[PDB]
Curated annotation (Swiss-Prot), chains A, B:
Induction details: By phenethylamine.
Cofactor info, note text: Binds 1 copper ion per subunit. Contains 1 topaquinone per subunit.
Active site positions, chain numbering: A290 (proton acceptor), Y374 (schiff-base intermediate with substrate)
GO function terms (MF aspect): copper ion binding; primary methylamine oxidase activity; quinone binding
Source taxon at top rank: Bacteria
Keywords in alphabetical order: Copper, Disulfide bond, Metal-binding, Oxidoreductase, TPQ
UniProt-recorded name of the protein: Phenylethylamine oxidase
Length: 620, 620
């Protein structure tokens, strides 16, 4: 009965039926996106009306549509025709992936380019890459995908070890036409294989690792009810899943005394982009929006016990729609478990003679997705002390290219003749705040150094300052590690026993943001990535920092346009959008399969509680 | 019979005997420091002469001495008379802590100050704080300690909850006289107790935490030989212990196939300082060097199984000297264990159909120390992929004061009338580098943004630049989180299969450095804390970033003096000194006992290996 329950197979089938009945889902139609709509602010209808939103693609080219339906009433609430040439193309369909290689396989220009390289077409894999928006006039109003080739010597061969540089093709996946085939010259195809499961490369397997047994005799400390409602060590929340954003956390709250205190209404990674910094014409257009263009949730992996999730794990198997509206379950796509997290608090007192030690723990909610060569792990952590944290784990195989003989300033060499273009992995966390309720405000906190003089004769004093962001136009902030800059989200109407507004402090990793030139296509399409922190007034239709349609869409929507409304955010229903990412200069150690690298952020209570909230943790 | 073996109780007793028979250990003498000397560069001399370094304090005031003895030959190698007024005072003795409170208890000025506040002198605890160096001319030449009072209502009461503000005294612990008692006014002593084990504060203990069993049925994957030589998953190292620095890692090396490749010769936290930023004259002089002035190693805690260290733990029990030269063992003062560390590498390939997942592990070597109200955990981690990491965990009870009526810009309120002065916890990691040998160099790597134009028409390109630090005069570097600055330690004479110098990249947390005014005493005495990274040419006598006798030294000793030599560091035996710390604006949540906060750094292989070094890890 929870209005925050996961989408069921039945609801998805019902959406399919409603669309069919409305004459909106004929045989030429495809569901590019389907997701449940969150309830509007303030308990509207007496009961909860379950609604879903869908992006309908048309394989014949007719205009696509955005439709919202009520599975409860079996009706179409609204259907609008989409002008893709203006608002953007629909997310890429998995069924379009193979279309690129297949079409090029019969194109004389492509075959000629391969022959010139002595490559057998039957062994050439082509990666279906999003196209973005550049200077190609013919692409206006065309659903395009670009292809980069990789040689696969045999069925189980890792094609990434064999990039075919100097070649790229543009394909219209709807009209089934190869618009362009660019060949800037023949580069040697890196010879070494990158098969990390081949003993020839792994050598004899280590026999030195002893087993580590992690078990919970009496079961986990958390409970799961209503299918996705979690309660663990004072925490309370609902675990949602969206085909686009993946795991989404709802109603994060903390039990303080006799009341459930809200902290975050909705938390998610609203976008993740991978911009490449190689100026070569073959890849200078490369910018992969995993979330917005491909929909990361769609590719969530089924997690194996013992391998992906170790210990006493509780799985959730979310359901998504396939391209035809049929429900598809992602078996064990979300795993949840608690784990020991070292020392929480400790003190040995020289005067009282009392020695005290308490261990910490954290609740883990995660999923792992795979998009082509990359694999990303998304982890949300809840700690005993009230800290909330997110961590992204990037691994998989690096996207490759040829390494020029004369060397490069935008590519690193991973093996003889094998290159790895520089790139970034930039995420955007959308945090719909609710610190003790919806009346919130954000304060930028900087360390303040003081000059030696009257009032500070020894020159030891240092302080800090807090600046309230009152309007959206002044809520676009940059990190400043040098001054220990953080952002506090507080509730001006809710004070702790010391008469201070309760709050939570956001700690960023302060990694470099988007490096692209500000006048580049990517700087516009990924504007959110140019600044560390954005604050907007909550609005039902402001969901992603890049807008609803990112594929082949120019700038104009997303965060920059939202902030333009310059709404009041001083003690209002606000949303924090935090940009964070990794700048990757591939190492030889990253080849042939890369070890995990991490990035993220966390929010710690700041005067939210009246004292430590973990004084009731048992000794043993 | 390793030259890096832990000191035995016998060796300490032997040092004591040598000193006594030499007439250097009379009744008035005290061992202020005692530690074994590392082998000098070049072990080409069979049988290493075991030598110990000793700082001998004279409670009579007669000049103290620095003595080097050979326990192998039973002789005094050298004994130098120390002029403390010039080179600094000796480290504070634990037995001196007590003298401050006892001396003040008989001083009329102190008693009057307490009487006015209606405090029973028998209930007043006095924290023995180091002095420092300021405008007090009568202190030069005198061994001083300052005292700050706290009320302890009963034997098991936490005195930190009851600071006595507006009062501070200075005492000459040698002549045993109170030189000054400053009373700036009466402040209410905070009323609430901070007894975190008292049910009235903890409330009913949670009964919701289910047990987590962590075991290793076949034992740990690491071996310990020669008492302290560790070998784990290709790693090799020696775990040493010094009363001043605590746990020290020696000869960190990694088995790359046929050869044992060195990485770091010696790693340690050579200093840790806690500067306070409250301009009040009661505390504006407060700066305590846990390592240099108090010797954090001597206060290492005995770690209890199941509380401090969980899982299959292997303990080391280092032995230190007491103030009289008697050996004292710190039972289970060092914990060593391995632990699962999530996903190491993962990839599901769409073309090969191969799914691959491998788990990561880390070797943990740690200890926990207690200095008055603070407790610090020191952790060194070795990862499967070759990464080396250090992490400091700060907890304990915050140093308190009164919270002024009218508020404060340098103190936070944690309870009614109770304040917590702003301060920092700044560490210095001394890394004697040995990347594939001693011929090393350091390069500062910055991200480089590129402007849109010829050669970068789309404005997507970005690069990086490396600057070799060739002389010490140019090796005092600052962090720059915005340009993703890191430092690479490479060996220009050792190349990987791609003909590139092998190296390791240092990743800093980019936290704020010393905030105090550049003209302050603390900015001079802890100059190392003003910059993130220093590189010096290796030298036997350059051990600490603050010099050998930190206590009451005028400043400039250590790093500033070493760097002044302006030696060649481009492809030489070098040492990296990394400054990193936490800036603490205490939160209500930190009271009455604070949750652990962390800070650290790590080093990852950068073209050190010819490809991923963890391809030989099994599935398990
Ligand atoms: Cu990457
Ligand atoms: Cu602190």
């Amino acid at each position: 009965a929870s209005p925050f329950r996961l989408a069921s197979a039945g609801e998805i089938s019902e959406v399919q039926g409603i669309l069919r009945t409305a004459g909106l889902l004929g045989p030429e139609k495809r569901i590019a996106y389907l997701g449940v709509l969150d309830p509007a602010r303030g308990a509207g209808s007496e009961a909860e009306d379950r609604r879903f939103r869908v992006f309908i693609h048309d394989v014949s080219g007719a205009r696509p549509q955005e439709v919202t339906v009520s599975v409860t009433n079996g009706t179409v609430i609204s259907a609008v025709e989409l002008d893709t040439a203006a608002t953007g193309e629909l997310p890429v369909l998995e069924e379009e992936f193979e279309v690129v290689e297949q079409l090029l396989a019969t194109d004389e220009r492509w075959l000629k380019a391969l022959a010139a390289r002595n490559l057998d077409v039957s062994k050439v894999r082509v990666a279906p890459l999003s196209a973005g928006v550049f200077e190609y006039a013919e692409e206006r109003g065309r659903r395009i995908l670009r292809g980069l080739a990789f040689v696969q010597d045999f069925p189980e061969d890792s094609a990434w070890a064999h990039p075919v540089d100097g070649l790229v093709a543009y394909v219209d996946v709807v009209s089934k036409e190869v618009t362009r085939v660019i060949d800037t010259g023949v580069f040697p195809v890196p010879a070494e294989h990158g098969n990390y499961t081949d003993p020839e490369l792994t050598g004899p397997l280590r026999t030195t690792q002893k087993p580590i047994s992690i078990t919970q005799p009496e079961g986990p400390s958390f409970t799961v009810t209503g299918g996705n409602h979690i309660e663990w060590e004072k925490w309370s929340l609902d675990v949602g899943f969206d085909v686009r954003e993946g795991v989404v956390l709802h109603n994060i709250a903390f039990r303080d005394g006799d009341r459930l205190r809200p902290i975050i209404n909705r938390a998610s990674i609203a976008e993740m982009v991978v911009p490449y910094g190689d100026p070569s014409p073959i890849r200078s257009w490369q910018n992969y929006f995993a979330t917005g263009e491909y929909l990361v949730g769609q590719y969530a992996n089924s997690l194996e016990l013992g391998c992906d999730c170790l210990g006493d794990i509780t799985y959730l198997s979310p359901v998504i729609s396939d391209a035809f509206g049929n429900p598809r379950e992602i078996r064990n796509g979300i795993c949840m478990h608690e784990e020991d997290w070292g020392i929480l608090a400790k003190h040995s007192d020289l005067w009282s003679g009392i020695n005290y030690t308490r261990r910490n723990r954290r609740m883990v909610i995660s999923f792992f997705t795979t998009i082509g060569n990359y694999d990303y792990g998304f982890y949300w952590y809840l700690y005993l002390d009230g800290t909330i944290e997110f961590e992204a784990k990037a691994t998989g195989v690096v996207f490759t290219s040829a390494f020029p003989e004369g060397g490069s300033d935008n590519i690193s060499q991973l093996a003889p003749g094998l290159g790895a273009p520089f790139h970034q992995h930039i995420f955007s966390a959308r945090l719909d705040m609710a610190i003790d309720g919806f009346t919130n405000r954000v304060e930028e906190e900087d360390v303040v150094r003081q000059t030696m003089g009257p009032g500070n004769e020894r020159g030891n004093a240092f302080s800090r300052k807090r600046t309230v962001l009152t309007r959206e136009s002044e809520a676009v902030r940059e990190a400043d590690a040098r001054t220990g800059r953080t952002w506090i989200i507080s509730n001006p109407e809710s004070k702790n026993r010391l008469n201070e507004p309760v709050g939570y402090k956001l700690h960023a990793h302060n990694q470099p943001t988007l490096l692209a030139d500000p006048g580049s296509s990517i700087a516009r399409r990924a504007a959110f990535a140019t600044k560390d922190l954005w604050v907007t007034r909550y609005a039902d239709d402001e969901r992603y920092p890049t807008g609803d349609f990112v594929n082949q869409h120019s700038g104009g929507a997303g965060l920059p346009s939202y902030i333009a409304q310059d709404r009041d955010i001083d003690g209002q229903d606000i949303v924090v959008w935090h940009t964070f990412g990794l700048t990757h200069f591939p190492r030889v150690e990253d080849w042939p399969i890369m070890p995990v690298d991490t990035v993220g952020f966390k929010l710690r209570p700041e005067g939210f509680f009246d004292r430590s909230p973990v004084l009731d943790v048992p000794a043993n």
